[PDB]
Amino acid sequence: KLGQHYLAALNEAFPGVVLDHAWQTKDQLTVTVKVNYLPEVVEFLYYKQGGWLSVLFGNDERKLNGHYAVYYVLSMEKTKCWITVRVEVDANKPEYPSVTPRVPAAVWGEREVRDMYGLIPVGLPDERRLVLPDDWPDELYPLRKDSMDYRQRPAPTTDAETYEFINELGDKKNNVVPIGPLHVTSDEPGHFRLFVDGENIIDADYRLFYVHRGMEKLAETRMGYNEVTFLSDRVCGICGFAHSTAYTTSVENAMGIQVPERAQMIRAILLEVERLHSHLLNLGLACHFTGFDSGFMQFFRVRETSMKMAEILTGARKTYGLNLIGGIRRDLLKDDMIQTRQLAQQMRREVQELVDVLLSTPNMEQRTVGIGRLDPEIARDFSNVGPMVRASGHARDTRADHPFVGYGLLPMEVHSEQGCDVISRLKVRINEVYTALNMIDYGLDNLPGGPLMVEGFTYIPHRFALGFAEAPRGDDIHWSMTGDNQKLYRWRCRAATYANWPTLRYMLRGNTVSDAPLIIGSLDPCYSCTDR
Amino acid sequence: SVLYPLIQALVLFAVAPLLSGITRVARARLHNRRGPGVLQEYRDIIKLLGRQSVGPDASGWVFRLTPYVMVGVMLTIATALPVVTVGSPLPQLGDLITLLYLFAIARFFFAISGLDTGSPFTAIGASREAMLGVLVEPMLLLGLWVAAQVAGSTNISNITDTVYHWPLSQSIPLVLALCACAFATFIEMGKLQEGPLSEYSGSGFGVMKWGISLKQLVVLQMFVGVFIPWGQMETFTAGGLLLALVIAIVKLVVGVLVIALFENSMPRITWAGFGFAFLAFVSLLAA
Amino acid sequence: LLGPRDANGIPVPMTVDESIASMKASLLKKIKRSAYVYRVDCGGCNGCEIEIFATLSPLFDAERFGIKVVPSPRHADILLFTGAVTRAMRSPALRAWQSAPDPKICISYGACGNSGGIFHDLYCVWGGTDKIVPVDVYIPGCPPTPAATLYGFAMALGLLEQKIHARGPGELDEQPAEILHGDMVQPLRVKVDREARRLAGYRYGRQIADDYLTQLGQGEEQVARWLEAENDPRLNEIVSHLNHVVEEA
Ligand code: SF4
Ligand code: FCO
Ligand code: NI
C-alpha cells in the first residue's frame, strides 16, 4: 500500500493528530486531522516531505456528519502517492486555521472557500472576493446545499466594479494599463492592471472569474453522472478531453470499475493528440508577439493536420464527448489507426522545419530572454504545475508520477529546462510535441484489444476519490463524491492554470508593457478552465 | 496660378486609398492569403462616412475638428509636391522648412486629439507618434539639406531639377542623402492592437483614414518625386502628360510594394538613417 | 445605471428607440460590401471564440466578403456576442454596446450566446445575450462551424437568405409509428444492438449491428461479406461477438 511511510512520519511528528485515515485506491490516501492543528500538518507534508499543494476545497457534509469538510490534497513526489488532509469545521461557527501564512499555494483555494461555502480561514491576509462577481449579495454562499436554489438570481447591487487592486511596489502616481476584460487577441475575458511607470511594469494586479458560470453547483443539482462528461467538455474547447478524463477517472476510482485494457490507453492516445492541438496553438501565438506572422499562419497549418487526426479519431472539432464512466463512447478502427501513425510522422517532419524559426534566433533571442522570469523559488512555494514549473527546473509531470490511463505502457519522457524565460517555456512545449508524437507512433500499433465498455454497475453512495489528467497547461485534479445511483454529492475541479495564475504578479514585474501580452501568453492561459 | 495646384491637391487626395489598398493587398499576398480587393479602402471610408461620429463626454471641439485639420494639412503638403513636372505647382509654399513644419502641425494636432480623449491607449499612441516625429524630422531635414546645398537653394523644384541633371561631380553627397531620405521615408511609413484611433468613430474615423492614407501618399511622394524626377517635365505641356501620370503612379506603386516587402523582411535603421545622413554631410566637407 | 431593470432590480434587455431602429435595413445595405465586426466575448468557453477567430484563417476567410475585425466598439457596425452573460460580464458587454455608434447590428454566436446553452438556468449567468441587448441574427452551434459563421454573416449582410424555419404541430404527429427492422424478433435485435454498442460505439454499433441485420438475410453469404470486405481485425471481432450473442440467444 502506497503512503504508509508518510503516514508513519506524520504519526511520529504528530502523535495523536490523525483522527482517521483511509485508502481510496492503492496510491490514494486521506487523513482526518485535528482542526486547530491543521496548518502544521500540511506545512510539514509540503516542506519537509516534498509535497505539492494540488487542490484544496470545502464541502457541505452537515447532513452526513454535522460538520463542514475542508480537504487539502497533497501530491507526494519524492513511492509517489496522494495524501488528502481533511478537517471537520464546526457548523454554526465555521472557522478553521488558515494555511496561507505557511504555504503560499493556499492563497486562492482559501479565498474560494470564503465565497462558495462561507467558511472563514482565520489569519488569511488576502480577504478579497475571488470567484463571485462584485454585484453578488453578501451572505448568499452558492455551494452551500441549503443557501439558495441553483436557479435563483439575485438583483445586482452595483453596475460598476467595486474590486480593490493592491499596489505592492507602486504608489499613487503610477498609471494603469488595462488588458481586459474586452481586449483583442485575448479572445477571453480577464482584467489586468499594469501599474506602470513609463513602459516598465512596476506592479501588476488582475481581476479574474469573469467567466464564472457556476457549474460546480449545477453538476450536483440538475445533472447526473454520464452527463457531467458533457459539462467537462464545455468548460474550454482545448482541455475538453483533459477535464473529461480527469472527471471519469475520479468516478472510476471511487468505485472499483476494472476498465477494459484498450479503453485505458486510447484515452492516453487522445490526451496526447489534444496537446498537439494546444501546444501548436500557443507556439503560433508565440510567433504573433515575437514578430513573425508567417510563423503563426504556418503553425496554424500544422495545427490543422493535428486537427485532421482529431477529425478522424473522433469526427469532431473542439468540444467532443468520447468518454463515459465505464469506458469510451465511439471506438477507433484499423485504418484510422494505421493512418494516424504517419500523419504523426509527417507532423514530426513539418514540426521540425517550422521549429527552425528559433534556430533563426533574432526576436527569439532578445524579446524572449530575461522576460517574464518565474523564480523556481517562487514556483515551488505557489505549486505551479504546467510548463512553467518544468521550465523553472522541477520535473513535475502527472504521467510519470501517477500513470492514470495506462501511460506505463507508453514511452514517457519528462522534459525540464533550467532557464525561466519565455523561450524556455517554448522549449518545454517543443520537446513535448516530439514526446507526444512518439506515443502516437508507439500507441496505435500495439493495441491490446478486448472490450470497450463496462456498464450496469451500481454507484455506491458517499464514495469519493481523486481523478487526475495531464492537461496541456498542467494537471487538472478532479475530486468527486458519489451521492447515489443518479446524482453527485459534490464534484470539485481545479484547472491546470488555477495553480499557475497567482504568480503572474512576479512575472510581469520589471518588464515592459509591450511584451506583457507575451508574458501572459507564455504560460498559455485557459480562463474558461480556471473561471469555471 | 490656381488651377494646377488645386487639381494637384484634388487628384492626390482622390488617389490616396489606392496606395493603402495596394499596400494591404500586398501584405495579404505576402502572408499567403487571397486578401481583399484594392478598392476595399474606398468602401471602408465611404461606409464610415455614412456612420455617425461618437466620442466621450469630456471631448470637445478638438476631437471632432482634428481629422479635417489633418486632411487639410496633408492637402497643403500635396499641393506643393511635384508629381508630373520638376516644378512644384506652388513654389512659394514648396520650401523645405515649410513642409517640415506643416508636418509638425499635423503631429501636434494628432497628439492633442489623442490627449483630448480620456483613453490611455490614444494618449500613449499620441506620445509614440510624437516620438516618431522627433526622431524622423532632423534626419529628413539633413537629407534634403545636403541635397539643397548640393543644389544651391532651400527649395523644392531646385533640388528636383538638380538631381534631374545629375552633376557626376558631387555624386557621393547625392547618393548618401538619397539613402538617408529613403531611410526617413521608411521610418515615417511604418513603426521603426488597440491603436491610437480607438476612440474615433463614424465620419471622424473615416476622415482619419483619409488623412492616414494621404500622409502615407505624401511621404513616399516627397521621396520619389523630389529624388526620382527622371520622367517629369521642366515646363508643363499638354501632350506628354499621360507619360508623367503613368510614371508617377508606377513609382508610387513600386514604392509601396518594396517598402511592404522590406518591412515584412525585418535602433539599427534609426542610427543608420542618422549615420547615412552625417556620411552625406561629411562628404561635402571632406571633398 | 448602465442597463434597465425591473422593480426587483433584475436586468432586462435594452429597448432601442424606433428612430434609432428605423434605419437598420439601410445600415445593412450600407455595410453589405464592408462590415466592421467587434467580437464581444462574454462568459463562454474558448470554442466559441477560437472558431470566430478562425473565420479569418487560411481555411475560411472573412476579408474576401468584406468583414474586418476591429479593435474598438467605436469602429464597430456589427457587435458579435459570444458567451452566456455572466453577472460579472453584463456590465462590460453593456459598455461595449453603448460605446458603438447607433444604429448597431448584434449577432449571437453559439448555443451559449443564444440562450445560455448548458448553463441556461444558473445563478451566475443571465442566460443568452438577448437577455441584455437586442439580437438581430442568431447563430447556433457548440461551437459553430466556420461554414455556419460565414452563412450567418452573409445572411446578416443580405448576401444569402434564411434557410430553416419553425415547424409546428400538424397531421404527421398523430400518424402511427412503425416497427423498425420488423423481420426478426425485437429481443434479439435489442440484445445485438446493446452488444454492438458495448464493443463499437453508439454510432459504430448501430452501424455494425444494421450491417449484421441485412446479413441475417443470408447467413453464409453476408457472414462472408462482413468477414472479407472490411479486412478490419476490429470489425471482424465486433461481428464474431455479435454472432455469438444471436446464436446463444
Ligand atoms: S456555445 Fe458552446 S463552445 Fe461556445 S461558449 Fe457556449 S458552451 Fe462554449
Ligand atoms: N490545459 C488545460 Fe484546461 C486549463 N487550464 C485543463 O485542465
Ligand atoms: Ni483550459
Curated annotation (Swiss-Prot), chain A:
Gene Ontology molecular functions: 4 iron, 4 sulfur cluster binding; NAD binding; NADH dehydrogenase (ubiquinone) activity; nickel cation binding; quinone binding
UniProt KW keywords: 4Fe-4S, Iron, Iron-sulfur, Metal-binding, NAD, Nickel, Oxidoreductase
InterPro entries reported in the protein's UniProt record: ComplexI_49kDa-like, NADH_Q_OxRdtase_suD, NADH_quin_OxRdtase_su_C/D-like, NADH_UbQ_OxRdtase_30kDa_su, NADH_UbQ_OxRdtase_49kDa_CS, Ni-dep_hyd_lsu, NiFe-Hase_large
GO-annotated cellular components: formate dehydrogenase complex
GO-annotated biological processes: anaerobic electron transport chain; anaerobic respiration; formate oxidation; glucose catabolic process
Co-factor(s): [4Fe-4S] cluster; Ni(2+)
Family stated for the protein in its record: Belongs to the complex I 49 kDa subunit family.
Protein name: Formate hydrogenlyase subunit 5
Species of the source: Escherichia coli (strain K12)
Upper classification of the organism: Bacteria, Pseudomonadati, Pseudomonadota, Gammaproteobacteria, Enterobacterales
Swiss-Prot record, chain B:
Name of this protein: Formate hydrogenlyase subunit 4
Organism listed in the record: Escherichia coli (strain K12)
Regions annotated as coiled coil: none
Keyword Membrane recorded: yes
Primary localization class, coarse: membrane
Single annotated GO MF: oxidoreductase activity
GO cellular component: formate dehydrogenase complex; plasma membrane
Residue ranges annotated as Cytoplasmic topological domain: 23-66, 114-130, 188-209
Cellular compartment(s): Cell inner membrane
Family designation: Belongs to the complex I subunit 1 family.
Membrane-spanning segments: 2-22, 67-87, 93-113, 131-151, 167-187, 210-230, 242-262, 267-285
InterPro entries: ComplexI_Subunit1, NADH_UbQ_OxRdtase_su1/FPO, NADH_UbQ_OxRdtase_su1_CS
Database matches in Pfam families: NADHdh (PF00146)
GO annotation, biological process: anaerobic electron transport chain; anaerobic respiration; formate oxidation; glucose catabolic process
UniProt subunit comment: FHL comprises of a formate dehydrogenase, unidentified electron carriers and a hydrogenase (isoenzyme 3). In this non-energy conserving pathway molecular hydrogen and carbodioxide from formate are released.
Keywords: Cell inner membrane, Cell membrane, Membrane, Oxidoreductase, Transmembrane, Transmembrane helix
Membrane topology per record: Multi-pass membrane protein
Swiss-Prot record, chain C:
Source superkingdom: Bacteria
Chain sites annotated for binding [4Fe-4S] cluster: 42, 48, 112, 142
UniProt GO BP: anaerobic electron transport chain; anaerobic respiration; formate oxidation; glucose catabolic process
Keywords associated with the record: 4Fe-4S, Iron, Iron-sulfur, Metal-binding, Oxidoreductase
InterPro entries the record matches: Complex_I_20kDa-like, NADH_UbQ_OxRdtase-like_20kDa, NADH_UQ_OxRdtase_20Kd_su
Cofactor note: Binds 1 [4Fe-4S] cluster.
Swiss-Prot/TrEMBL cofactor(s): [4Fe-4S] cluster
Transmembrane segments: none
GO molecular function: 4 iron, 4 sulfur cluster binding; metal ion binding; NADH dehydrogenase (ubiquinone) activity; quinone binding
GO CC annotations, alphabetized: formate dehydrogenase complex
Family as reported in the entry's similarity comment: Belongs to the complex I 20 kDa subunit family.
Annotated PANTHER family: FORMATE HYDROGENLYASE SUBUNIT 7-RELATED (PTHR42989:SF1), HYDROGENASE-4 COMPONENT I (PTHR42989)
Subunit structure, as described in the record: FHL comprises of a formate dehydrogenase, unidentified electron carriers and a hydrogenase (isoenzyme 3). In this non-energy conserving pathway molecular hydrogen and carbodioxide from formate are released.
Record protein name field: Formate hydrogenlyase subunit 7
Native species: Escherichia coli (strain K12)
Source organism phylogeny: Bacteria, Pseudomonadati, Pseudomonadota, Gammaproteobacteria, Enterobacterales
